[PDB]
C-alpha cells in the first residue's frame, strides 16, 4: 500500500485564534479520509495527509512549508492555507515545487489572480462571490439605483471594487459611493441627503453597530429602506455609544445578510453516498468537544476533490514525484480543473481555480438572522424562500 502524500497547512495551536478553523475542520477531514480508505477508492494507494502548523504567521507558516519539503515525504499537493497573508506567500511560490494547492478557508479575492497564483484552487467561494448574488437580488426586486457604504480596510474595499465590474453593463446605477475609516455617520448622512434607498454595505461587525446607530439617527430604516450587508457576523453581534439597544434593533430590522452557504440544503445523496444532513450528523458526532467550523463542509469536499484529482492523474499516467516533475504537476493541475461532483457544499466545480458555489441570503427578523434565499453560482439563479422575507410596507421598497 504505497502512500499518496499531501501537505496539510493550517493553524492548529490553541494559542492562535484561527487555530479554531484548523481544529474545527479536522473531524470532517478525518471522516472523508476514513471513507476513501475503506472503500479502497485509491487502491492500491492510500491518502497520506501530513499536518503542519502554520500558526497563522508569515514566518512560522513559511518555515512550516520549508520543513515539510525538507524533512517530510514527497507531497503531491498542498491542502489548506487559512490565513490570508500566509496563503498568499505559499500560493505565489507553488510553481517552484510543481505543487497544486487546494484551500478550504482562504476567501481573499487576491488569490483569484491566475498570473500570480496559477497553481492555487479553493472549494470556498471568495469574499467577492457575494456580488453576482446581490446583482440577482437587485434584479429580482427591480432595484435599479443603489448606494454603497464601505469601510476603508482592504477586506471591504476589495469587495466594493469588484462590485463596479459586476454592475457594469447591467441596468443598475450606483448613485452614491461613500467610504469611512472610524465613524460612518458623515457617510450615512451623505447617503440620506442623496436620497439613497437601497444600501450595499461592506464593513466589519464592530462598524455595523455604528452604521445602524447612524441609520436610526438619520431615519434610514423602515418601509422605504433596504440594507444589504455582510452575513458572516457572529450571532448576537449587536448585544456584545449614543443609541439604545431597542433603537439599534429598530434600524437593524429587515437587513439582508449575504455570505457563502456552509452546507447544501438539498436532501440528495452526495459523492460519499450520504446526504448533506447525514454528513452534518456524522461530523457533529465525530467532532466531540471540538468547536464546529463553518468551513467543515469545504474541508470535507476538499478531501474528495484531492482523491478524485489523484484518481484522474493515475488514469492519465496509465493511459501512457520529486518536486522536479513539471509534467506530473501539470497532470494534477489539469485533473483538478475537470472537478465536477455533487458534494456536501453543493456542486463542486471550479472556474479558473475559483469555486462556483452557493451564496446564502439572510434577513434580520426581530431577534436573529433568518435564511430567506440562496444563489446558485453555476446556474446564475436565485431562489427566494416563500413566506420568509418580509417588508414593513405593502410592497418591497422603491429605489428612489
Amino acid at each position: 500500500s504505497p502512500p499518496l502524500s499531501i501537505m496539510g497547512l493550517m493553524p492548529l495551536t490553541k494559542e492562535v485564534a484561527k487555530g479554531s478553523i484548523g481544529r474545527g475542520v479536522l473531524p470532517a477531514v478525518e471522516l472523508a479520509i476514513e471513507q476513501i480508505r475503506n472503500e479502497s477508492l485509491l487502491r492500491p494507494y492510500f491518502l497520506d495527509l501530513r499536518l503542519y502548523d502554520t500558526e497563522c504567521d508569515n514566518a512560522k507558516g513559511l518555515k512550516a512549508f520549508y520543513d515539510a519539503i525538507k524533512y517530510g515525504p514527497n507531497h503531491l499537493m498542498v491542502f489548506g492555507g487559512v490565513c490570508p497573508s500566509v496563503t498568499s506567500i505559499i500560493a505565489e511560490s507553488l510553481q517552484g515545487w510543481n505543487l497544486v494547492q487546494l484551500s478550504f478557508a482562504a476567501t481573499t479575492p487576491v488569490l483569484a489572480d491566475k498570473k500570480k497564483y496559477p497553481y492555487f484552487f479553493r472549494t470556498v467561494p471568495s469574499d467577492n462571490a457575494v456580488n453576482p448574488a446581490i446583482l440577482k437580488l437587485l434584479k429580482h426586486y427591480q432595484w435599479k439605483r443603489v448606494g454603497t457604504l464601505t469601510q476603508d480596510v482592504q477586506r471591504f474595499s476589495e469587495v466594493r471594487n469588484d462590485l463596479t465590474g459586476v454592475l457594469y453593463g447591467e441596468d443598475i446605477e450606483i448613485s452614491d459611493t461613500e467610504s469611512f475609516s472610524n465613524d460612518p455617520c458623515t457617510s450615512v448622512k451623505k447617503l440620506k441627503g442623496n436620497d439613497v434607498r437601497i444600501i450595499l454595505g461592506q464593513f466589519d461587525q464592530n462598524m455595523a453597530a455604528k452604521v445602524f446607530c447612524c441609520a436610526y439617527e438619520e431615519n434610514m430604516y423602515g418601509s422605504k429602506y433596504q440594507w444589504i450587508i455582510p452575513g458572516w457576523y457572529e450571532p448576537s453581534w449587536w448585544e456584545q455609544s449614543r443609541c439604545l439597544r431597542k433603537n439599534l434593533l429598530a434600524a437593524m430590522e429587515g437587513y439582508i445578510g449575504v455570505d457563502f452557504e456552509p452546507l447544501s440544503s438539498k436532501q440528495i445523496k452526495t459523492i460519499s453516498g450520504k446526504t448533506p444532513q447525514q454528513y452534518e450528523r456524522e461530523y457533529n458526532n465525530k467532532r466531540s468537544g471540538v468547536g464546529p467550523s463553518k468551513f467543515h463542509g469545504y474541508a470535507y469536499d476538499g478531501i474528495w476533490v484531492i482523491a478524485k484529482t489523484l484518481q484522474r492523474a493515475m488514469e492519465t499516467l496509465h493511459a501512457s514525484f520529486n518536486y522536479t516533475d513539471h509534467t506530473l504537476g501539470r497532470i494534477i493541475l489539469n485533473a483538478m480543473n475537470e472537478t465536477n461532483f455533487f458534494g456536501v457544499t453543493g456542486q463542486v466545480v471550479f472556474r479558473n481555480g475559483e469555486r462556483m458555489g452557493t451564496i446564502k441570503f439572510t434577513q434580520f427578523q426581530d431577534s436573529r438572522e433568518v435564511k430567506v434565499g440562496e444563489y446558485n453560482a453555476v446556474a446564475d439563479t436565485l431562489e427566494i424562500i416563500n413566506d420568509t422575507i418580509r417588508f414593513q410596507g405593502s410592497e418591497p421598497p422603491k429605489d428612489d
Binding site: 514566518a59 513559511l62 518555515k63 520549508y66 506567500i89
Partner: protein, 407 residues
C-alpha cells in the same frame, strides 16, 4: 593559519520591475575582492557570495530562499534587492536568526522593527525626501501644503510620514487627493481650493497625465510650486503618450519651475572613501565589468549602495570577529552583529554610511529645479545634521517664491 570562509546568501533582481542585480552583482563581487585583499578588515575570514536571480519576484525568491537556507553552507547574512523581495525575506529571516541587509529597497514599510527585526538597508526609504520637503517649506516660509498621490502603497506611506513631519514643524496639509490612474478630478479640485504649494507623488506615466491636466487647468504659474520625485527619465514631459491631449510645448510650459528631491547615491566630491577609490574611479571600474553600457544596465546608480553594503557588513563582522560557529537555531552571534551593524559609521562610495533606529540608511538629498526645460541643482540637504547646501541658482517668476495663499 587558515582563513575561514564565511557566506552571504544574496538575491539579485536581473529581470522585473527593477533589474537592479545587473550592475549590483558585479559591484558586490568587486566589493568582496577589495574587502578580502585587506588585512586590516577580516584577517581570519574570507567573505564568499552565493546568489540567485529573484527576477524581482517574491514567489520566485521563495524557491531561492529555501535553496539558500536548506543547503549547506550556513549563511551569516541575507542580501535581497527588491522592496517586494526584502518584505518577504526580512519578515521570514527571524525564524533562522538572520540579519537582512538590502542594497535596493526604498519601501517605507520596511522601517518596521516589529515586522522586520534584523533588517538594514543601504538604500534609503522613500520617506527621506520628507525632511528635505519640510526644510524647503521652512526656507520659503510656507505653512499650507496640498498633496496629490497615485493610489500606491509607497505614496500612501510617504504621505503618512509627511503628515507627522509637517506637524513637528508647525505646518499643515490643506488638501489630500488620490487617484488610481486618472488625475482629472484631483487636479480639478486643486484649482477649486486655490491650493498654492503642492506636492505630487506618482510614477512617470501618471506625472504626464497630471501635467496635461495641470496644463488644461491653468494650474501653473508664479502662484504655483510643485514638488516631485527627481527620479523620472530626462525630458519625461516631452515624452509622447497617445493618451495625452496636451503637447510638448504646453507640457514644457506646465512642468517649468517644479522642484524635485532625489537621494544622493554617489558622492559628488572627489574625496577617497574606505576602499581608497574616488566616486569617478568606482564608476570607471564598474563600467569595465559590464557586458553592456551603464545606460542599458539596471541598477547602475544603486550599484554604490550595493558596494557599500558589503563594506558595512565587512566592518560589522570585523567589529565582532567566532563567525564559523553561526547556526540558524541561535540568536547569540546575530545580536552582536545587529549591535555592530546598528553602529555603522564609515565613508563609502555613496557617501557617509549610517543607519537610523529602524535600520534605514541616512543620506544627502539633491534638490533640483526645472529651469528652461532643464534641471539645475539648487542644493543638497543633510537630514541628520540639518545641513543645507544652498547654491544661488533657483529661479522664480517675479524674483521670489510665491506664497501658500492669496496675498
Amino acid at each position: 593559519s587558515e582563513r575561514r570562509a564565511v557566506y552571504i546568501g544574496a538575491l539579485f533582481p536581473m529581470s522585473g520591475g527593477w533589474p537592479g542585480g545587473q550592475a549590483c552583482q558585479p559591484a558586490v563581487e568587486m566589493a568582496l575582492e577589495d574587502v578580502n585583499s585587506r588585512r586590516d578588515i577580516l584577517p581570519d575570514y574570507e567573505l564568499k557570495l552565493i546568489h540567485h536571480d529573484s527576477k524581482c519576484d517574491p514567489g520566485q525568491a521563495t524557491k531561492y530562499l529555501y535553496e539558500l537556507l536548506y543547503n549547506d553552507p550556513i549563511k551569516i547574512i541575507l542580501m535581497p534587492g527588491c522592496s517586494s523581495v526584502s518584505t518577504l525575506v526580512a519578515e521570514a529571516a527571524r525564524m533562522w536568526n538572520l540579519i537582512v541587509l538590502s542594497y535596493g529597497s526604498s519601501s517605507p514599510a520596511l522601517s518596521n522593527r516589529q515586522r522586520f527585526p534584523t533588517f538594514f538597508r543601504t538604500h534609503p526609504s522613500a520617506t527621506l525626501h520628507n525632511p528635505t520637503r519640510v526644510k524647503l517649506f521652512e526656507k520659503w516660509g510656507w505653512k499650507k501644503i496640498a498633496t496629490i498621490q497615485q493610489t500606491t502603497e509607497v505614496f500612501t506611506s510617504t504621505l503618512d510620514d509627511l503628515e507627522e513631519r509637517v506637524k513637528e514643524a508647525g505646518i499643515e496639509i490643506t488638501f489630500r487627493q488620490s487617484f488610481f490612474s486618472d488625475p482629472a478630478v484631483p487636479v480639478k479640485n486643486l484649482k477649486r481650493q486655490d491650493a498654492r504649494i503642492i506636492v505630487g507623488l506618482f510614477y512617470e506615466t501618471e506625472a504626464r497625465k497630471v501635467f496635461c491636466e495641470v496644463y488644461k487647468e491653468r494650474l501653473f504659474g508664479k502662484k504655483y510650486v510643485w514638488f516631485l520625485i527627481g527620479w523620472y527619465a530626462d525630458n519625461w514631459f516631452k515624452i509622447y503618450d497617445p493618451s495625452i491631449n496636451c503637447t510638448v510645448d504646453e507640457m514644457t510650459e506646465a512642468v517649468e519651475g517644479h522642484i524635485t528631491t532625489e537621494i544622493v547615491m554617489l558622492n559628488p566630491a572627489n574625496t577617497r572613501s574606505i576602499s581608497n577609490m574616488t566616486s569617478q574611479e568606482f564608476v570607471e571600474k564598474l563600467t569595465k565589468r559590464l557586458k553592456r553600457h551603464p545606460e542599458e544596465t539596471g541598477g547602475f546608480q544603486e550599484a554604490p549602495l550595493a558596494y557599500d553594503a558589503i563594506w558595512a557588513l565587512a566592518l560589522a563582522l570585523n567589529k565582532t570577529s567566532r563567525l564559523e560557529d553561526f547556526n540558524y537555531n541561535n540568536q547569540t552571534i546575530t545580536d552582536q552583529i545587529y549591535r555592530a551593524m546598528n553602529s555603522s559609521s564609515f565613508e563609502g562610495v555613496s557617501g557617509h554610511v549610517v543607519f537610523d533606529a529602524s535600520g534605514s540608511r541616512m543620506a544627502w538629498t539633491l534638490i533640483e529645479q526645472l529651469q528652461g526645460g532643464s534641471y539645475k541643482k539648487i542644493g543638497y540637504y543633510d537630514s541628520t545634521k540639518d545641513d543645507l547646501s544652498w547654491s544661488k541658482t533657483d529661479k522664480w517668476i517675479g524674483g521670489s517664491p510665491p506664497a501658500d495663499d492669496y496675498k
